[PDB]
Amino acid sequence: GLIKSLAEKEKQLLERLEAAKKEAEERVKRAEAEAKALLEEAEAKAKA
Amino acid sequence: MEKLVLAGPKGRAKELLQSLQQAGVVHLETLRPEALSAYQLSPEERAELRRWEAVSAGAEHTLSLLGLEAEPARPFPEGLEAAEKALSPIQAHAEGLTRQKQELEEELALAQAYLEPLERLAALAHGLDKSPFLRVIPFLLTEKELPLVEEALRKALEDRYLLAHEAYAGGVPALVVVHRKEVDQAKAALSRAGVAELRLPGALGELPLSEAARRLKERAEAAPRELSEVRQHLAKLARESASTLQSLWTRAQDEVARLKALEELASGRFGFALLGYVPVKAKPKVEEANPPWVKPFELLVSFLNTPKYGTFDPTPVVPIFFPFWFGMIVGDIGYALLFYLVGRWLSGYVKRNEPLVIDLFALKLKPPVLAKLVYILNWMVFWTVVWGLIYGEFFGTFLEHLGVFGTPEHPGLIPILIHRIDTAKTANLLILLSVAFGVVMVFAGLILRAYLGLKHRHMAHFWEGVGYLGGLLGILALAASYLGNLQAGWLSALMYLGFGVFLLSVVMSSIWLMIPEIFTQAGHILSHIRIYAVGAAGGILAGLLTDVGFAMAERLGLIGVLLGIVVAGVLHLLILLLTTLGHMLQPIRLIWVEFFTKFGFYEENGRPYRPFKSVRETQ
Amino acid sequence: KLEAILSQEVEAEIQALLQEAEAKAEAVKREAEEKAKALLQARERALEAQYRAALRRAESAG
Known part of the structure; x- marks a missing residue:
């Protein structure tokens, strides 16, 4: 009858899940950038 | 908060809500x-459900073995772990005891049969059944077979065979003893007659006769004592822990139902x-939210509240039943008089039956729970017997009198000589008084029938239902022209012609493709009249059988007749009961003409919801 | 009613997960610091040897 109930939880649930994907991606990217950059210094220092 | 899930039907969305x-x-x-x-x-949820079924089943299994099964309404909340740990020791113990018991019982059954033959046979060739030199073969023969077998063996085996027999009370167990290597020949001879070798099951069959015979005699003596013990241990275990299983059963069942629901x-x-x-x-609060007339009405309120069609309450049914139902009882000499006594045995208690224990604690032929439900019914019976005693004096208006009829209140020879309900005028009016109620019920069903199509908003039912009620008027009209002739009913001889127009004139507005079938609508009218007539007249007939059962049917009547008639009277009682119970089914037979034909009632050819017969079973 | 709130019971499980993997995004970095570091302890000792060796040779030559 009321379509309103089932619509408005579905599209709040969809946002919760997308927002889970967001902070998972925005983290793995970072961790690799940090590790890349640590070792760059370890090459910069090693030769010097 | 706790999340809760709800279901219902589409039709009651608003009422449920x-x-x-x-x-x-x-x-x-x-x-x-x-x-x-x-x-x-x-999958985890399904595994709990599988496991909840095992516990349910597993109890049914244990509890059936142990003794009788009983399903209470009392569960005991427990874990998966708690319920399975409860169940495992008792099922194991009981499984073990029943197995012993089966072996003990089979052994007895064989040993009881075959001890006496093996004793006889062993005796005949004592100490020669374990020799290699001689071969023995046991076999059973009846008196009839013994000569044939002997001939056959004698020709086959010459005169160097030994046929011996010894009795046992009936036939003879016979033994033929033959040389080793003459075995095939010996066998062949039995096989041609159709007689074959006797061998028992298991080790005993294979053992020498003498061993087998000694051991069978021992098993018959031992088994009955050990059987007694195993049956005793099993009884105690039921006694102490039948409840444990029953409470697991109920709890387990509630969880199965919950997970199935989801x-x-x-x-x-x-x-x-x-x-x-x-x-x-x-959470609790959600689950939480003159006796003859009031009492069944308060239980019916649960059906007031759930409608299903354009139908009205199923409650008009109960006061139509009651007058008509009481008036099937009309005796006063050994019919209603005897029946008074019957009432007390169902609304009190008896022990004069075996399957029935004491009713006061709810123990009958019927299941113990069902018996507690039909307290209400038993009361409604008690109210019917009571009122029937009153309508037995109503009948005695038409019998007893000291001047109007030719039979006193109690003659001094024997109560009741000849019935005086054999006056022609008297029988007709009691039949016509009875008919009047049947007519009232014809109007009440078809008036609701129309209201049904008005508020269920299908004009085809409205139109058909209105029209059929015109025919009743014609039916009664026509009768008056014959009950009063032209002295009365010359006030409806001209309305009848037009009453006939009404039957068809509204029905045709829906059209309808079987116009003849209207004949069967007129059939339903006719039945209410005939059934109420049968209800009086057949009721009165009940009394007139009692003439020859507790009334003068010996000599000219005398002092001796009082205690002489009771020979026929008792024989007459079971005969009388069977035909008068047949009348008491008329109220429901009447009700169903209208009820299942949707005359302000729920039913109409099928459809969920019980016949009123089954509703009134408990109420 | 729980509707919008219905979604915060998931956002709390799926926040438990995302913290368990920011407890692995720390562990990974620990091991990688202890790796990067050890590659320069080997760098330190091997060079030290080659400087001990270079002055010793140059003394025997002198």
Whole structure:
């Protein structure tokens, strides 16, 4: 009858899940950038 | 808050919602089936359900073995772990005891049969059954077979065979003793007559006769004592722990039902569905939210509240039943008089039956729970017998009198000589008085029948239902022209012509493709008249059998007749009961002409909801 | 009613997960610091040897 109930939880649930994907991606990217950059210094220092 | 899930039907969406809304549950929102999908049980949930079934079944298994099964309404909340640990020692112990018991019983059954033959046979060739030099073969022969067998063996085996027999009370167990290597020949001779070798089951059969015979005699003596013990240990275990199993059974069953509920709701198998929220406090509160007339009415209120069609309350049924039902009892000499006594045995208690124990604690032929339900019924019977005693003096208006009829209140020879309900004028009016109620019921069903199509908003039912009621008027009209002739009923001889127009004139407005079938609508009218007539007249007939059962049917009547008639009277009682119970089915037979033909009633050819017969079973 | 709130019971499980993997995004970095570091302890000792060796040779030559 009321379509309103089932619509408005579905599209709040969809946002919760997308927002889970967001902070998972925005983290793995970072961790690799940090590790890349640590070792760059370890090459910069090693030769010097 | 606790999330709660609700279902109902589409038809009652508003009525269900209003009721739930009131009950405790708040925040009710509707959910369509596409929303319910994707909330089917996860594999873990299905494993709990599988396991809950095992516990349910597993109890039924243990509890049946141990003795009798009983299903209470009292569960005991426990874990998966707690319920399975409870169940495992008792099922194991009981499984073990029943197995011994079966072996003990089979052994007895064989040993009881075959001890006497093996004793006889062993005796005949004592100490020669374990020799290699001589071969023995046991076999049974009847008196009839003995000569044939002997001839056959004698020709086959010459005169160097030994045929011996010894009796046992009936036939003879016979033994033929033959040389080793003459075995095949010996066998062949038995086989041609159709007689074959006797060998028992297991080790005994294979043992020498002498061993087998000694051991069988021992088993018959030992078994009955050990059987007694195993049966005793098993009885104690039931006695102490039958309850434990029963309480697991109930609890386990509630959990199975809950998880099944969620899988059904999940596949979108309930059309109207709600979601709402209850605080922990509200959770109980949701589940929480003259005797003859009042008493059945208060239980019927549960059916007031759930309608299903354009139908009205199923409650007009009960006061139509009661006058007509009481008036099937009309005796006063050994019919209603005897029947008074019957009432007390169902509304009190007896022990004069075996399957029935004491009713006061709810123990009958019927299941113990069903017996507690039919207290109400038993009362409604008690009220019928009581009122029938009054309508037995109503009958005695038409019998007893000291001047009007030719039979006193109690003659001094024997009570009741000749019935005086054989006056022609007297029988006709009691039949015509009875007919009047049947007519009242014809109007009441078809008037509701029309109101049904008005508020169910199908004009085809409205139109058909209105028209058929015109025919009643014609039916009665026509009768008056014959009951009063032209002295009375010359006041309806001209309305009848027009009453006939009304029967057809409204029915045709719906058209209808079987116009003849209207004949059968007129059939239903006719029945209410005939059944009420049968209800009086057949009721009165009940009394007139009692003429020859507790009334003068010996000599000219005298002092001796009082205690002489009772020979025929007792024989007459069971005969009398069977035909008068046949009349008491008329109230329901009447009701069903109208009830299942949707005359302000729920039913109409099938459809869920019980016949009133089954409703009134408990009420 | 729980509707918008219905979504915060998931956002709390799916926040538990995302913290368990920011407890692995710390562990990974620990091991990688202890790796990067050890590659320069080997760098330190091997060079030290080659400087001990270079002055010793140059003394025997002198």
